[model samples]
Each structure stands twice: as C-alpha cells, then as structure tokens.
Target: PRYLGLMSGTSLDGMDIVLIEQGDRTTLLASHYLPMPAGLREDILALCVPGPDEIARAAEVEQRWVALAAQGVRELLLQQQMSPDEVRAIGSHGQTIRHEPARHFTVQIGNPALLAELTGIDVVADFRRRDVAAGGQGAPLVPAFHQALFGDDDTSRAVLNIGGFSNVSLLSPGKPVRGFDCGPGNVLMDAWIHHQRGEHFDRDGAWAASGQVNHALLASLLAFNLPWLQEHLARHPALPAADIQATLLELSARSISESLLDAQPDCEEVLVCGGGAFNTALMKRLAMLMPEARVASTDEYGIPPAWMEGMAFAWLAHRFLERLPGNCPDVTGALGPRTLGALYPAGSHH
Candidate 1:
C-alpha cells in the first residue's frame, strides 16, 4: 500500500510530507517541505505556556495548523501524480504543542478528522498518547522506523536525530534497541538567535561560527552556565552574542557525545539525520568528541537527512494500516507492543 506521512517536528518551523510505497521492497516515492505560518508557529509556542484565554486561542491555532497539514497532503499527492484515493491513507503527526511523557500525557493539536474532511483521504493520527497510556515515554518514536532502516544481520549502528530536541537510537540485530531523548538539538540555538537577531534560525550555524567559543567561558559554561544549551537562554542574556551561540553549539555537542558514550559506546557508526546534520560546526564537534566512532550523515547510509522523520511517519502509517506495532517497547517503555493511532475514514464525514 501507499501512504502519505506528515510531520512538523519541534526543531523545524515547517511541515514535511513523504509519499511512500510499502511492498516487496519499500520505496520512497516523493517528498515535499513547506514552511509553517509564522503566526501559527507563534501561537503553538504560546500555547505551551500559561496565557490568557489560552484555550480559545489554541482552538484557533489548531484549525490553522490542520489546514497546513491538509495542504501538505495535497501538494505531495499532486507531485506524485496521484490522488487521495490512490493513496491508502494519510498519517498526520499533528504539530506537537506539549510532550511531557513523565506526566503520562502529551499534546499534538492538528485535528485528523478535520484533515480527512479537508483532503478527502483516510487519516491516522495522534500516534503518541497511546504509548504513554501503556506506560511509555511517548517520544523518540522513531526506533521502530530506525530498526527497519538501520538494522542489519551483519552489523550495528547508532542513529542520532537532531530536531527541536535530539534523541539517539542504538540499533543492533537480535536485540531490543535502546533509544531516548538525548538533549537539546536546534531549539535553544534557534531561540537564542531568534531572540538576538529576529531570525528564525542560525543558518548552517553560521551566526554561531561568527563568534569564537571562549575556551575560558566554555569551561564556565559547562561548569556553571546551567548545563543544557537552554541554560544559556535568557540567563544573563547580556553575554556576547557570538560566545553565547558558540556555547549552545558546544552544549549540543557535549550532550550528544555523552549520550552516545553512556548508551551505546560499542556501536560502530553514528548515522546522524534531521536538520542538525547540515550544521557543519555541530557535525565537526560530533567527530571530535567521538573519535572512536564513525560520525556521518544518514545520506551516506542511503536516506537524506532532511526527510527521515517525514519518511518514518509514512512507514508508521503503513504500520497502522497493516495492524503492525508502531512503538518499540524498549525505546518507549510501553508495557508491550501495541498498535498506535486513530483512523478517520475519507469520502464521507467521519
């Protein structure tokens, strides 16, 4: 069957859609990227915190984001020379507004039923809460997709996904893979630059490179700057812009390297995907920190870095339709394997 997977990851200010054909040999048909509405993005961030009339505003934002999601499905289907009917289903991973797995709950706000009505396509969505309910982290849900992509009978490797938040997946055959959210990825960095320069992100981490990492302050940062990349955020925001940016890069590098060392020191290679793979400074630091492990982008291993999550969701939709389990227990800590998501049928109001 063919499926369209939609995702708007936290780190990115956009939506990604992938058309996938799952058969004897899985094939990636087409993929498209679309920028998030700036107003909608602001509301999403605003909804995560306490605000006046928050629920009412959140309701409006949800509808706008849902329209964006349905728009993605339409573009991808058109690009692939297919229609809603030819596609078996749309797997819409609603924009995640809140993901507090510790609370045994998470929130993603795009309405799948509305998406189905808009696109005239069957939609399966809300993929994380079920796992949280079943006793799980409800996150880093990519391991099941990771296991299928990177797993091999001959060797093993670790997968690092650097999005708004970074997560690492330790993959080896004949073993329940280990995976978890490692630390900050591009979120803090983006937020910092956004606050300082009113830009969306530090393109290729260039703004970050403009300033040198104060080796002197680097120590102070690691020792007392509050630890995570976010520690640098708004905490004495008067610091040198370049140095603060450099500190964020260092923080991302340190957390990722430490996670790989502590979680999967023996993995032969690290396949990095997502937006972080493009950050040359961050990639160089990965290699510097883990000299023993081969650090390279997933493009070297077959899949382009930018589309992994979008592609993963397409496969997740395939899993949902086939009644195959989508969340990996070891990674998410669910009680046992269980199918995830709810389906909204197309053609009729469902």
Candidate 2:
C-alpha cells in the first residue's frame, strides 16, 4: 500500500510530506517540503502558549495548515505521477504545539476534515492520545518505526532523533524494542538562539560553537525533572538554553553511550537522525563523549535524517490500513501491540 505522511514538528518551520510504499517493509518513493508562511508560523507559535484571544487565531491557523497539508499531498502526488486513488490514506502528525505528557495531553493542530476534503481520501491522525491514555508518555512514538526499519540482526542498536526535542529508541537486536524521550534536543537551543540572537535557530551551531560551556549551569540543568529522563538517569534531558545546548550535546551523547554501555558497551556505530544531526557542535561533542561508539547519520543507512519522521508517518498509515499493530508495546509500555491513531473522518463534525 502507498500513503502520504505529513509532519510539522516542533520547529514550526514547514510541513514535510512523504509518499511511501509500504508492506512487509517501507520505502519512500518521494518527499517534499512546503514552507510555512511567516505570518502562519508566528500565529501557530503564539498558539503554542496561547493567551485568552488566541483560540480564534489557533482555529484560523489550523485551517491554513490543513489547506497547506492538502496542497502538499497534491504536490507530492503530482511529483510522483500518482493520483488520490493510488494512495491508501494520509497520516499526519500535525504541528505539535504543546506536549505535556504528565498531564496526559499533547496538542497537534491540523484540520483532518479539511485534509480529507482537499485530498479526497481518508485521513488518520491523532497518533498520540492512545498511548497517553494507556498510561504511556504518548511521546517518542517514532521508536517503533525505528525498530522496524533499523533493528540489527545480532547487535543492539539505538536510534536517536535530534529534532526540536530529542528521543531515543533502543533496538534490542532481537524481537522486542525499548525507547523513550531522552530529553531536550534542539528545543532549548533553538529557543536560546532566538532569544539571544534573534535567529530562528543556531544554524549548524554557529552561535553555540562561539560560546563556552557554562559548567555550573550545565550541572544544574542535568538534574532537572523530565519524567522520562528521571526514570532513566543515564538518559536525562537538558534544561536552560545555552547551557543546555552544550549540556544537551553531552546529555544526548552520554545518554546513548550509557544505554548501550550495559548492553553493548563495546558497540560502535550509532545512528543519529533529525534536524539536530546537522549541528556540527553537537556532533563534535557527541563524538567526544561516545569515544568508543561510532557516530553516523541516517544517510549511512539509506534514509535522510530529516525525512525519517515523515517516512515514519507514511509507514504508520500503511500499518493502519493493514490492521497491523504499529506501536511496540515493549517500547511504549502499552497494554499490548495495538494499531495507534484516531480516525477523523472527512466532515464538519470532527
């Protein structure tokens, strides 16, 4: 089956749309990015931490996003020379504005009805609620996809996605999978860069590379309470922006190293993905901390890091259509393997 996966992660940069052919395995046929307009981006970000009047603004932004999503699907299909009937469904992650798993809630804004209407196909979205409802963090959901794609035949491997927020998936070299949010990836760093430099992000860690690591601040940040991180000390998340950026580099690298230390301590070769993979400073720091482990990008494994999440969604849509379980119970702590995602049919009622 073939499906479209749409994603607008924490970066609020744009929508990543992918056309994937999936079955026993998944393959990306074509992918494209649709840039978010400046006004729309600002509006969506404002809604992330909304004020009283922002509700209307959020609704308006949702309409725009859904429209853009549909346009993206159309563009991708045209690029691939396919039609709506040729695809199964669209799996959208939407725009993750707020993700407070402790509160058992995560908000991703996009009008599924509009997506269906525009594309003339079924849409599967709201992928997080089921996991959260099942007493799971409802985050780091991509690990299951990672397990399916990258699990080793004889060696335990870890896949780290360094996006707006970093998460880890541990492939146990066998059948089961283990994974969770390790901590702040590029979120704080991006925030800091915006705060101090008025830039959207640090741009390959140029600003971060210029600054020195504040050890005292870094130490304090390492101790912050991020439930997933606290549950696994070896995988704690970072706090504070600039300090955390340097610390995140250490935190991310060390966390992966430590996770593999007990299981595959001597294991070299770790696959890193997501937007953060491009940060030279973070990569350099990771190399230093995981001296024993070989650090490489998703490109080494045949998938571009930036497209992993998008492709993951496409894979999810395939699973949804096949009535196959997508989330790994061992990885997400769900009751058992289950098909994840809430179907929002095309209409005004949703």
Candidate 3:
C-alpha cells in the first residue's frame, strides 16, 4: 500500500506532505509544501521556550497542527486526483518544539490520534522519543532513511541536508553509516537577515553574494555566542548587512565541508538536499570548500530538496507497518535498535 508522510522542520517555514507508492521500486507520487498559517509559527516558536502557560498553549497548538496536516493531506490527494483509500498510512514528523537529549527531554507536537481521525488513515508519529529515552541525540533520524535511499557500493557518497541546522549522512557500500549535526545551516542566516533587514530569508544568497565575507565577523558568528550581535552591530554600525549574510553562508559551507571530510574521508561526491540546496551562493561556497568532491542537489539523484524529509517519513511508515527498526543505533548512539515511532490506527474509519 502507498503512504503519506508529513514533515514540518525547525525552520518554521511550513509543512511538507508527500505521497509515496511502494512497488518494485519506491516512488514519490506527489508532494506539497504547505506554508504555515499566520501566528502558527510564532506560537510554535514560543513553545520552544519555557513558561507563559506553555503547556496550555502547546495543547491548543497541537490540534491546529493536526488540522493543518489534514488540510495538506486533502490538498495533496486532490492535486494528485487520488483517494484516501489509496493511502495505507500517514507518517507524520510533527513540529519539534524542543529537543534536549542531555536532559532526556524532547517534544514533537501533533496529535497522531487526532491526525488519524481527521485523515481517515493510520498515522505513525512521535518518532524521536524512544531513541531519546534510550539516551541518544534522537535527531538526524533521517540517516537510516538516507541509507535506504541513497547508499551505494561502487562509490562512497555523502547526503548533506542543510535545513534549520545542517546534518550529513555518510553512505558507503558494506559499511555502517554514521551522521550528526554539522552545525547551523539556514538557522543563523535566516535569523540574522530577518533581524537586520526584516526579511524571512536572504533568498538565493543574493544579499550575501553582493557582499564580501568578513573573516573577523565570520569567526565571531561561528562561536554563535552572546548577541554581541546587537553589541557588535552597535560597535561597527557601518558593518555591511551583506557581509554578515556572507559570513553566515561561510558558516554553513565550512561546517558542512568539515563534517563531510572528517566522516567520509574518501567520499567521492555529495548529494545535497533540504532548503539549503536552493541557495545558489551557498552551493557555490560548498563546492569551493569541498573542491575534491562534487556538490549537487538530490534532485539530480531522484528526490527534490524540499520533499526529501517528507518522503523519508513515508518510508518510515512502511518500516513501522512491517515491524522493522527505523532508527540507526550506530548513527544516533542509541543502546540498540528501536522501532522509532508510535502508531495511531484510524480504527473503524476505513
């Protein structure tokens, strides 16, 4: 049976819904990137911090999340001229409000039971807790899926996904795969630009490319420490916003390049995905940084940058249905293999 995967990442951008058809070969039948509603993103961001009737606000937001997810399901199905009956299940990677593995606390809010009820399909979600409980970072969970989709034998390849925070999965034939957070991806850049210029993003790195990389500023940004950001902006009032943007781009490129070279010492090529792949300047920077390897979008390989994570959840739903382990112990440093998600059956709604 085919499946639907819903994903909303740290970017607070929107929800991505993907429909996958499983046959002799797995195919991503359809995908949709649904931009979030007004105030919804702000509410989610608020939930990330402590206090302010947080629990009540989170509870309220959870249902809204499900409603939006169901809306995506309906929209995607309509666009594809498909039916709910065609989807066996929905794999929902709900919004991650918080992840503090050291404190053994992580929260991804989207009520799977309500999602199942609304979508009329079994829903598999809550994918990260079990691994966190087992004392793992419980993130970059997509590595297992990345292996299944991109691993190759003849040549060692790396899948670098630059989302809110960049992460990479090192893939090779006959080898245990490993991956982790490479560091800030679009997070700093987005935040920085939004702070200075009042824009959601720099867009294709236009602003960054127009300016030069300030090496001193670059070092300061890498520390990602106290917002002497305001202090520095105050000190160097003449600092070019574009210079800061370029520096953030360097941060992403350097972190990704360093992590890939360190992990897959002999990796021949890199497949890039996530929203970062769309940044023309960042891609150029990465290619320049990793001169020894090829840097290209995952679209060239089969998956589009935006839909990759959503498709992974569809694959995970299949794994859960078959009672297979979805989290890679080697990658996440879990005690052992864990099934990785909770299932909410639609019950008699079929």
lDDT against the true structure, each candidate? 0.82, 0.75, 0.85
Clashes of each: 1, 1, 0
Best by lDDT: 3
Per-candidate TM-scores read: 0.85, 0.77, 0.89
lDDT of 1 by residue, 1-350 (tens): 98888988774478888888888545678888889877877778888766789668878888998888888788877777787888888888888777788888898888888898999988889899889999998877888898888888766688999877788888876788888788888877887788779986788888888777766555655561224544534455456888888878988889889988887777689999988999988999889999988999998877888888888887878888889999998878889888988888886633
Show where candidate 3 strays beyond 4 Å. 50-57, 103-105, 219-237, 348-350
The CA-based lDDT of model 2 is what? 0.75
> Candidate order by lDDT, highest to lowest?
3, 1, 2
For model 1, give the 10-residue run with minimal summed lDDT: 224-233
Each model's Cα RMSD? 3.7, 6.3, 2.7
For the record, the alpha-carbon RMSD of candidate 3 to the native fold, in angstroms, is 2.7
Give candidate 1 misplaced runs (Cα > 4 Å): 24-26, 49-60, 98-103, 195-198, 207-211, 224-247, 348-350
Model 3 residue 204 CA deviation (Å) reads 1.7
Clashing pairs in 2: 269-294
Error of 2 at 253 (Å): 4.3
Tens-place lDDT per residue, model 2, 109-197, is 78777778888878898887777777666766788789788886887677888877667777766568777666667766665566556
Clashes of 2: 1
